[PDB]
Write a protein that binds this ligand. Structure first.
Ligand SMILES: NC(=O)C1=CN([C@@H]2O[C@H](COP(=O)(O)OP(=O)(O)OC[C@H]3O[C@@H](n4cnc5c(N)ncnc54)[C@H](OP(=O)(O)O)[C@@H]3O)[C@@H](O)[C@H]2O)C=CC1
Ligand SMILES: NC(=O)C1=CN([C@@H]2O[C@H](COP(=O)(O)OP(=O)(O)OC[C@H]3O[C@@H](n4cnc5c(N)ncnc54)[C@H](OP(=O)(O)O)[C@@H]3O)[C@@H](O)[C@H]2O)C=CC1
Ligand SMILES: CN(Cc1cnc2nc(N)nc(N)c2n1)c1ccc(C(=O)N[C@@H](CCC(=O)O)C(=O)O)cc1
Ligand SMILES: CN(Cc1cnc2nc(N)nc(N)c2n1)c1ccc(C(=O)N[C@@H](CCC(=O)O)C(=O)O)cc1
Ligand SMILES: CN(Cc1cnc2nc(N)nc(N)c2n1)c1ccc(C(=O)N[C@@H](CCC(=O)O)C(=O)O)cc1
Ligand SMILES: O=c1ccn([C@H]2C[C@H](O)[C@@H](COP(=O)(O)O)O2)c(=O)[nH]1
Ligand SMILES: O=c1ccn([C@H]2C[C@H](O)[C@@H](COP(=O)(O)O)O2)c(=O)[nH]1
Lengths: 547, 546
């Protein structure tokens, strides 16, 4: 137990990194990893100018002290140095160039002991209440003589590089700023053997970018109230049924994380839950599943666009499918001719005849979503008919209610037409959307009866999130929450091995969705009115790994 | 440093109490309280004979030690006793009758320091593995001498009586056995202002009764933890309507550490909406606090989730259910049974305000019963014969459960978009979806609009009862009822009444018994339904208005 210097003196690094203009040239087949986030500085300032939320984070972490924990720290440091026996503050250590780019208004940093590394400048060159050191050794000496809680290295690139190479960083509080800026200085490549990610925060939006916060940890290389807890768990299981058939040593990364606050973990945990506690069942398909019943996921669309990052999704298909719904189309050829094959297997001669739809033309999918959204209750004829002002246009009705009766508890769009189910290639998986309006903000609940977690759910989160934006925009509202309720939630046995890979990937900060803001009517959107920005993602996974 | 002997020596009572037969006595509008549960013994044995879960709990609590936590408890007991001096075990103190009540198979109680209070007997009638004592003071002595983790008073009635009388009990680990037996000995009345409940477990079934486990407390008179603070850096100074609702009004709710009783799923949502709800106006000028999207789950295999923090009546809601199953839309059928759930929605004025100018009073239009038995049929009037018109979705979901239990399309849907404008009211209960695994039926009901103070308590009961009915006619056991709330709201006029309700500690849930001979969904009648062992707090008038 030859105690480490960074452990005795609680020396941490905190930084913010953006993505870099591109030294590889263009983004077609873009590879991503931790090192995508490495931009620290440009021309002596920040690459992004201002990030209000990162600065709030920076201030809270570097200012926070827990006075009741100091005693254990003082003792520990005393022993290490061989030693005996008014507001506690953290130390912040910065390079001279970093000190100089802090605005005057903010220097020295409030409620913190400020330490500047310089050779060119000495105490006489500073007016301010700061300690000047001319080498790293002088920090260890200084920390031996101060009362302080923790010590934060706050940059810049030269200072980070020398604290990391000297093995003096216990943890890295790392902000991922999910946008690209011109940068002339970079955080050092973090060695994956020296440091592991132990925590990932929620995703936020600030100054027109998404960001999250992650923590890297240096790799190894009253009392009767806790008794009451134990008592109330007397009737628990020694084992989970498929725990012995899905070995959690296959989830080394997923289980190594302490805080899993990134909203992608809502999806990934449900997979975990189904893998460990799911019911082995047959299904319509013959494939066989693990299943569970009843889950709820919430995504904050004001803060991010929840496109899964732990594998590659493409949105052109599901944006085209959604536009096809809104037009009220049931013609499978329209999608096929845009090279969207979502519905191809469900429109075949064989699939239709197995549904007893012997009088249905190939790719005529019958009165599915689009027909129900624009014409609920009309008699379906064929995919070419003009159902002009036939049946209930519930899409137009919900837009009307959101504009004119926003507190209505009756703003629902329902695809589950009980009369029409046997005429549909497939009864709807997405039963209903309900809308909620508070203070100029639109939330949406979608109830999904049947949830393919490997293949379907990722696309479905994106569809209904995109659809919430479209409806919010034409009603003059801001999008708030997309809330996804899972009925029969299943993992197909043929997805297990690929979902196991996916679960050991750490999510990236989400992207953002921009809509052309001239679109004033739900019918007026086309594919080029939609931009996904700053999609950072792990490699595409084939769910079916057959060959 | 003010320290009492019950805290010094960590002397706990542990007991199991049932309810008591009143051999030709009271029972009118029954008043319940904690003293409802006081049955300890009959003819020197347990009133209920056998309860394997209570015995499993007794064994776990009385057998459990944290050795790591002892140092601090040896320190404390030495300071007190003016002193400072193999494997750690708890003490169990019982009366001689209680000792003799135990079967020889199991005495002496495995891995415990057994102690017996006895005026009659002495060490020579027993052995040296067990200890005898002659009075209560002789235990304070023997505790002072021993290496023991905690000291457990395991009865009987006389032991508990004097141990409480003298105030030597720090905490009471009290099993509530929610059935009635013949009793000849009782636990003593526990005084409110002397002992308070601090924890309430999940409700369970064992040996054909519900039970739960509550904990009474005596009333008075290292670094990864920072990472947690950092992740909360963007949080609020307060919760939105905090100034407005005042959490000091929730002292009992907030004083509890473990709130595992499933009734807390309902009470926690009321607390969530009061603290964090959005102020809105509705179809009227009436105030609500509203939030969007909640799930509750009730284990129908372990209990019937009839709220306990206030009094609920089910005759009306069971009749409404039978009325739905018959396909009826005739509101007069219910009014003639004094079920007035739909009365306000049937009046001339209400139908005229819905634009239903050509609808007969109490002709509720193509609501639930019509959609359940006849989805897609043209509604005419409430008197028409619709036989074999529309989709009988009720019949269909039952055949699906029986023939294709792994179908993901077992769905009963009342939201008929084409018919909404013809209904007195569009359905609040949009759909039921069913799920079958290993001979067990679960049901999700999605509710678009949830009156939490008045509606949701009945709605939990309706759909739990319907789950039992569907399960029984399909030869399945009910598993979970899962309630999804869309627009969840508390009416402002309910807030004072819900504040009272949140401060009441739930009782163990009742059970539902169906007549087991009914194997067709259409053949249930009101006499087929029995709620058993309903223990509840006083009725609450949700709207206090005089
Ligand atoms: N995004 C983020 O988290 C952060 C961004 N930044 C950005 O990074 C840039 C600044 O980084 P960079 O240019 O690397 O400069 P630094 O802030 O790392 O400062 C470098 C200078 O620090 C002094 N110094 C460093 N190490 C020592 C040592 N061991 N002994 C003595 N003096 C030492 C020397 O100053 P001297 O020359 O006077 O001797 C050296 O020239 C700016 O663009 C800034 O905005 C800054 C910090 C954090
Ligand atoms: N449900 C539950 O939680 C429990 C159930 N029970 C039930 O309760 C009944 C037993 O209770 P009960 O009949 O009241 O008997 P107890 O077990 O309380 O025994 C009372 C006897 O203990 C001895 N004793 C009591 N106080 C003293 C004292 N101060 N000093 C010395 N000796 C003392 C005497 O025995 P002696 O005459 O030998 O001197 C006295 O008659 C049974 O029916 C049993 O099944 C029992 C325990 C727990
Ligand atoms: C060294 N430096 C560059 C800089 C910028 N953002 C970062 N963000 C992170 N996460 N970590 C860093 N090390 C970091 N460093 C700084 C540091 C502080 C201030 C500054 O003015 N800080 C005020 C914040 C005032 C405010 O914006 O409210 C403070 O009191 O912390 C500016 C630049
Ligand atoms: C929304 N949707 C409908 C959907 C989803 N999951 C289903 N799952 C099952 N079992 N059956 C369905 N009919 C089904 N349908 C979609 C959306 C996208 C893709 C899709 O594009 N899949 C990728 C899969 C990529 C891969 O895993 O290699 C592809 O390239 O086709 C399929 C179905
Ligand atoms: C004193 N007594 C009556 C009795 C029964 N149930 C209770 N249950 C509770 N919750 N609390 C009590 N005080 C209590 N007391 C007892 C105590 C232990 C055993 C007994 O045989 N227990 C064995 C094992 C019994 C079993 O596993 O079935 C043990 O190891 O604790 C029987 C009666
Ligand atoms: O948008 C969609 C469409 C389908 N499914 C999945 C759920 C089931 O795996 C299958 C539909 O089959 P049934 O549930 O109808 O049997 O497709 C999705 O997850 N999302
Ligand atoms: O079974 C029922 C019927 C009604 N409501 C409540 C919800 C609303 O407060 C009101 C229905 O009116 P709208 O939400 O449709 O306006 O009654 C329930 O909670 N349960």
């Amino acid at each position: 137990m030859m105690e480490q210097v960074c452990d005795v003196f609680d020396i941490y690094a905190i930084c913010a990194c953006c993505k870099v203009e591109s030294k590889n040239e263009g983004k077609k087949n873009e590879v991503f990893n931790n090192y995508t986030f490495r931009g620290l500085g440009n021309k002596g300032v920040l690459p992004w100018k201002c990030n209000s939320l990162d600065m709030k984070y920076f201030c809270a972490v570097t200012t926070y002290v827990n006075e009741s924990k100091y005693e254990k720290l003082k003792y520990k440091r005393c022993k290490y140095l061989n030693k005996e026996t008014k507001k506690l503050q953290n130390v912040v250590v910065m390079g001279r160039t970093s000190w100089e780019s802090i605005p005057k208004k903010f220097k020295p940093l409030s409620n913190r002991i400020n330490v500047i590394l310089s050779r060119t400048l000495k105490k006489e060159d500073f007016d301010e209440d700061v300690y000047i050191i001319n080498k790293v050794e002088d920090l260890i000496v200084l920390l031996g003589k101060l009362n302080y809680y923790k010590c934060f290295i706050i940059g810049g690139s030269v200072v980070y590089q020398e604290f990391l190479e000297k093995k003096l960083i216990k943890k890295i509080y790392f902000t991922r700023i999910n946008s690209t800026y011109e940068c002339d200085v970079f955080f050092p490549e973090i060695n994956e053997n020296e440091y592991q990610i132990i925590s990932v925060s929620d995703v936020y939006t600030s100054n027109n970018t998404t960001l999250d916060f992650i923590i890297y940890k240096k790799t190894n290389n009253d009392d009767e109230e806790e008794d009451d807890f134990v008592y109330f768990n007397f009737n628990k299981e020694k084992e989970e049924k498929n725990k012995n058939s899905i070995h959690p040593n296959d989830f080394q990364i997923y289980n190594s994380l302490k805080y899993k606050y990134h909203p992608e973990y809502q999806y990934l945990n449900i997979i975990y839950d189904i893998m460990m506690n799911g019911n082995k069942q047959s299904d319509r398909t013959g494939v066989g599943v693990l299943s569970k019943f009843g889950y709820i996921m919430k995504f904050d669309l004001s803060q991010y666009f929840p496109l899964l990052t732990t594998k590659k999704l493409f949105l052109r298909g599901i944006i085209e499918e959604l536009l096809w719904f809104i037009r009220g189309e049931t013609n499978g050829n329209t999608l096929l001719n845009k090279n969207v094959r979502i519905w191809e297997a469900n429109g075949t001669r064989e699939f239709l005849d197995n549904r007893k739809l012997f009088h249905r033309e190939v790719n005529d999918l019958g009165p599915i979503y689009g027909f129900q959204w624009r014409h609920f209750g009309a008699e379906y004829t064929n995919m070419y008919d003009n159902y002009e002002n036939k049946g209930v246009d519930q899409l137009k009705n919900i837009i009307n209610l959101i504009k004119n009766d926003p507190t209505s508890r009756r703003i629902l769009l329902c695809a589950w037409n009980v009369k029409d189910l046997d005429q549909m290639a497939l009864p709807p998986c997405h039963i209903l959307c309900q809308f909620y309006v508070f203070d100029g903000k639109l939330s949406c609940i979608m109830y999904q009866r049947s949830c393919d977690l490997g293949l379907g759910v990722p696309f479905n989160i994106a569809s209904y999130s995109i659809f919430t934006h479209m409806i919010a925009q034409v009603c003059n509202l801001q999008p708030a929450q997309f809330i996804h309720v899972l009925g029969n939630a299943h993992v197909y046995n043929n997805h297990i091995d690929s979902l196991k890979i996916q679960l050991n990937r750490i999510p990236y900060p989400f992207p953002t969705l921009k809509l052309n803001p001239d679109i004033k009517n739900i019918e007026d959107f086309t594919i080029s009115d939609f931009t996904i920005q700053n999609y950072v993602h792990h490699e595409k996974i084939s769910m079916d790994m057959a060959a």
